[PDB]
Design a protein around this motif. Structure first.
Motif, PDB file in Angstrom:
ATOM      1  N   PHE A 141      23.787 -12.021  23.063  1.00 48.26           N
ATOM      2  CA  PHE A 141      24.451 -11.511  21.837  1.00 48.26           C
ATOM      3  C   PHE A 141      23.541 -10.553  21.077  1.00 48.26           C
ATOM      4  O   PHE A 141      23.796 -10.235  19.913  1.00 48.26           O
ATOM      5  CB  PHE A 141      24.859 -12.697  20.970  1.00 48.26           C
ATOM      6  N   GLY A 142      22.504 -10.034  21.726  1.00 51.40           N
ATOM      7  CA  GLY A 142      21.592  -9.116  21.045  1.00 51.40           C
ATOM      8  C   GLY A 142      20.616  -9.779  20.112  1.00 51.40           C
ATOM      9  O   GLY A 142      20.289 -10.965  20.312  1.00 51.40           O
ATOM     10  N   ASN A 143      20.186  -9.049  19.102  1.00 53.86           N
ATOM     11  CA  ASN A 143      19.000  -9.462  18.313  1.00 53.86           C
ATOM     12  C   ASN A 143      19.155  -9.279  16.816  1.00 53.86           C
ATOM     13  O   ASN A 143      19.616  -8.223  16.358  1.00 53.86           O
ATOM     14  CB  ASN A 143      17.750  -8.704  18.742  1.00 53.86           C
ATOM     15  N   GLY A 144      18.723 -10.310  16.075  1.00 57.54           N
ATOM     16  CA  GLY A 144      18.493 -10.203  14.631  1.00 57.54           C
ATOM     17  C   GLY A 144      19.735  -9.867  13.837  1.00 57.54           C
ATOM     18  O   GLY A 144      20.856 -10.349  14.158  1.00 57.54           O
ATOM     19  N   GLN A 145      19.564  -9.039  12.816  1.00 54.95           N
ATOM     20  CA  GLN A 145      20.693  -8.722  11.914  1.00 54.95           C
ATOM     21  C   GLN A 145      21.718  -7.870  12.678  1.00 54.95           C
ATOM     22  O   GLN A 145      22.866  -7.801  12.219  1.00 54.95           O
ATOM     23  CB  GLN A 145      20.234  -8.032  10.631  1.00 54.95           C
ATOM     24  N   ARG A 146      21.325  -7.237  13.808  1.00 54.67           N
ATOM     25  CA  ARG A 146      22.265  -6.450  14.639  1.00 54.67           C
ATOM     26  C   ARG A 146      22.786  -7.240  15.833  1.00 54.67           C
ATOM     27  O   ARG A 146      23.336  -6.650  16.768  1.00 54.67           O
ATOM     28  CB  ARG A 146      21.581  -5.141  15.061  1.00 54.67           C
ATOM     29  N   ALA A 147      22.661  -8.557  15.800  1.00 56.47           N
ATOM     30  CA  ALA A 147      23.299  -9.406  16.825  1.00 56.47           C
ATOM     31  C   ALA A 147      24.808  -9.404  16.640  1.00 56.47           C
ATOM     32  O   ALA A 147      25.349  -9.005  15.589  1.00 56.47           O
ATOM     33  CB  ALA A 147      22.727 -10.793  16.771  1.00 56.47           C
ATOM     34  N   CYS A 148      25.492  -9.820  17.680  1.00 53.28           N
ATOM     35  CA  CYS A 148      26.957  -9.849  17.738  1.00 53.28           C
ATOM     36  C   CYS A 148      27.522 -10.623  16.550  1.00 53.28           C
ATOM     37  O   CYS A 148      27.242 -11.835  16.396  1.00 53.28           O
ATOM     38  CB  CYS A 148      27.395 -10.527  19.015  1.00 53.28           C
ATOM     39  N   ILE A 149      28.381  -9.984  15.774  1.00 53.94           N
ATOM     40  CA  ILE A 149      29.058 -10.703  14.670  1.00 53.94           C
ATOM     41  C   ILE A 149      30.140 -11.620  15.236  1.00 53.94           C
ATOM     42  O   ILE A 149      30.502 -12.599  14.555  1.00 53.94           O
ATOM     43  CB  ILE A 149      29.616  -9.731  13.622  1.00 53.94           C
ATOM     44  N   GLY A 150      30.577 -11.369  16.448  1.00 56.43           N
ATOM     45  CA  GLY A 150      31.683 -12.089  17.080  1.00 56.43           C
ATOM     46  C   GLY A 150      31.239 -13.336  17.846  1.00 56.43           C
ATOM     47  O   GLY A 150      32.098 -13.937  18.488  1.00 56.43           O
ATOM     48  N   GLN A 151      29.964 -13.727  17.800  1.00 51.63           N
ATOM     49  CA  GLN A 151      29.457 -14.770  18.723  1.00 51.63           C
ATOM     50  C   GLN A 151      30.275 -16.073  18.566  1.00 51.63           C
ATOM     51  O   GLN A 151      30.646 -16.690  19.574  1.00 51.63           O
ATOM     52  CB  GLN A 151      27.959 -15.005  18.464  1.00 51.63           C
ATOM     53  N   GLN A 152      30.481 -16.542  17.330  1.00 54.40           N
ATOM     54  CA  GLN A 152      31.167 -17.840  17.126  1.00 54.40           C
ATOM     55  C   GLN A 152      32.632 -17.723  17.530  1.00 54.40           C
ATOM     56  O   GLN A 152      33.148 -18.623  18.148  1.00 54.40           O
ATOM     57  CB  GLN A 152      31.067 -18.310  15.681  1.00 54.40           C
ATOM     58  N   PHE A 153      33.234 -16.580  17.267  1.00 59.43           N
ATOM     59  CA  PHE A 153      34.642 -16.301  17.618  1.00 59.43           C
ATOM     60  C   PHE A 153      34.754 -16.378  19.146  1.00 59.43           C
ATOM     61  O   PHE A 153      35.668 -17.050  19.690  1.00 59.43           O
ATOM     62  CB  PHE A 153      35.067 -14.960  17.022  1.00 59.43           C
ATOM     63  N   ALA A 154      33.941 -15.598  19.847  1.00 58.42           N
ATOM     64  CA  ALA A 154      34.054 -15.495  21.311  1.00 58.42           C
ATOM     65  C   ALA A 154      33.814 -16.855  21.977  1.00 58.42           C
ATOM     66  O   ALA A 154      34.561 -17.215  22.916  1.00 58.42           O
ATOM     67  CB  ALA A 154      33.078 -14.472  21.787  1.00 58.42           C
ATOM     68  N   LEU A 155      32.811 -17.600  21.515  1.00 57.07           N
ATOM     69  CA  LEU A 155      32.485 -18.890  22.146  1.00 57.07           C
ATOM     70  C   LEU A 155      33.557 -19.926  21.818  1.00 57.07           C
ATOM     71  O   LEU A 155      33.849 -20.743  22.666  1.00 57.07           O
ATOM     72  CB  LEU A 155      31.081 -19.335  21.773  1.00 57.07           C
TER      73      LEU A 155
END
Ligand SMILES: CCCCCCCN1CCC[C@H]1C(=O)N[C@@H](Cc1ccccc1)C(=O)O
Ligand SMILES: C=Cc1ccccc1
Ligand SMILES: [Cl-]
Length: 454
Positions: A392-406
């Motif tokens: 999901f990438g890194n830091g403040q530029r990590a995926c905003i969608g991570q919880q949605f997608a999982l």
């Protein structure tokens, strides 16, 4: 200090012809296997460095030293995704404004509010497979893309793409897919101002107009109705950034919607496709996941809390993201002169590419069984060193969608494992197609109903 390795050159074209292939990320992974943790890649007018080891990527993930770069891929996608979250620079006003506005809409708490709409699309998938005739088969990435696109449409702006009602994509999706193809093709287009490409440019501008016209109309229609549907569009029309006190303007809302639809089409669908591929290739893992699904999913419709209880299914998904992270790279630039790993001096502005599939094959982290699909390697996640697992990438530029997608992927995979037995009836040979993302092309299975009602 040491000089870094570099792959084979083509005279004045330097390394550029290495990426003249339908599978350039897979080509870079083979170069990383030969050259190791870091290599230089030169092209006319540009240089970047590809990183593959946790030792160096942990330093690249230091936000005091490196920030997100727009890869040329993302710069070409920016022609239709604009200054949406994924194709904005961190220093653009609209990045932090949209981040602050949207972050609470994408939290684990927020998933309770999306769950019923996710179940609506997941039940459409289960019903489609229940309704197949004997020895018909499933086109896996096709059906997973129908599901993930429809989920983000229904959660993104209360819009039904109705993908399970169609052979041919919705026209918006025809345009978005062709624009993504144009964007990725331009990375390997020799002389782009050749009149041979006038047709490609006309088609690209038509595709941009199709996407903008549907999305601008959906925004204008919601603004007029005053309807307060609890979707991302309502959150975006109403929300104010606590820092600036400003809301997003209608153009930026359009770019956020286009961004979310790109991600919904391209990413979660690849994860679900890879996860089922690995389950049918590893029948003991499939059995363990299916046993969990049967024990937990005791009701006709999964609840929010039951999806959170599918722990082994979550580990299967993380192990699929380990081996084939569907968004396979991200780019960084040096904020100031710095030395990488005590060995590689970088100047301010120097670019890095993180090769996520190679990071995820670092034997110093995972051990000798790195190519094996073993979800149990996620059982004790505190033992994983920093920055070793970055799908999901890194830091403040990590995926905003991570919880949605999982949440969506755990729900769907749990339902698939509850309702069907699966057969790899063709003994399918993995073939990974590259778009913006990675997906397994031509992956087909047969699914025998356990005849459990919804
Ligand atoms: C989720 C999307 C991830 C994007 C992954 C990048 C996907 N690229 C597709 C080709 C390889 C890979 C990449 O390393 N490209 C870099 C460097 C580059 C710039 C110009 C031409 C060719 C390559 C870039 O785009 O700057
Ligand atoms: C890598 C994530 C992404 C997501 C949406 C649009 C462009 C890129
Ligand atoms: Cl040469």
């Amino acid at each position: 200090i040491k000089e870094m390795p570099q792959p084979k050159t083509f005279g004045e074209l330097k390394n550029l012809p290495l990426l003249n292939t339908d599978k350039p990320v897979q080509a870079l992974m083979k170069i990383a296997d030969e050259l190791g943790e870091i290599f230089k890649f030169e092209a006319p007018g540009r240089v970047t460095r590809y990183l593959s080891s946790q030792r160096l990527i942990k330093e690249a993930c230091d936000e005091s030293r490196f920030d997100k770069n727009l890869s040329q891929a993302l710069k070409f996608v920016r022609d239709f995704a604009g200054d949406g979250l994924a194709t904005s620079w961190t220093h653009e006003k609209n990045w932090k404004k949209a981040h602050n506005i949207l972050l609470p809409s994408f939290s684990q708490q927020a998933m309770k509010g999306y769950h019923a709409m996710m179940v609506d699309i997941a039940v459409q998938l289960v019903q489609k497979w229940e309704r197949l005739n004997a020895d018909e088969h499933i086109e896996v990435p096709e059906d997973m893309t129908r599901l993930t696109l429809d989920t983000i449409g229904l959660c993104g702006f209360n819009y039904r793409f109705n993908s399970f009602y169609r052979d041919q994509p919705h026209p918006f999706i025809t345009s978005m897919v062709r624009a993504l193809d144009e964007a990725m093709n331009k990375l390997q287009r020799a002389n782009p101002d050749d009149p041979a490409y006038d047709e490609n440019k006309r088609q690209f501008q038509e595709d941009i107009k199709v996407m903008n016209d549907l999305v601008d109309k959906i925004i204008a229609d919601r603004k007029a109705s005053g309807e307060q549907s609890d979707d991302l569009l309502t959150h975006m029309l109403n929300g104010k950034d606590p820092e600036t006190g400003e809301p997003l303007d209608d153009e930026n809302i359009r770019y956020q919607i286009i961004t979310f639809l790109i991600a919904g089409h391209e990413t979660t669908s690849g994860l679900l496709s890879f996860a089922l591929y690995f389950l049918v290739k590893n029948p003991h893992v499939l059995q363990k996941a299916a046993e969990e699904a049967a024990r937990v999913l005791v009701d006709p419709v999964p609840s929010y809390k039951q999806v959170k209880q599918l722990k082994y299914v979550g580990m299967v998904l993380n192990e699929a993201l380990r081996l084939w992270p569907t968004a396979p790279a991200f780019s960084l630039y040096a904020k100031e002169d710095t030395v990488l790993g005590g060995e590689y001096p970088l100047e301010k502005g120097d670019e890095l590419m993180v090769l996520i599939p190679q990071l995820h094959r670092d034997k110093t982290i995972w051990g000798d069984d790195v190519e094996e699909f073993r979800p149990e390697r996620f059982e004790n996640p505190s033992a994983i060193p920093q920055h070793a697992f970055k799908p999901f990438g890194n830091g403040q530029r990590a995926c905003i969608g991570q919880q949605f997608a999982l949440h969506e992927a755990t729900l769907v995979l749990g339902m698939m494992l509850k309702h069907f037995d699966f057969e790899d009836h063709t003994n399918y040979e993995l073939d990974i197609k590259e778009t913006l993302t990675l997906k397994p092309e031509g992956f087909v299975v047969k699914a025998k109903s356990k005849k459990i009602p919804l």
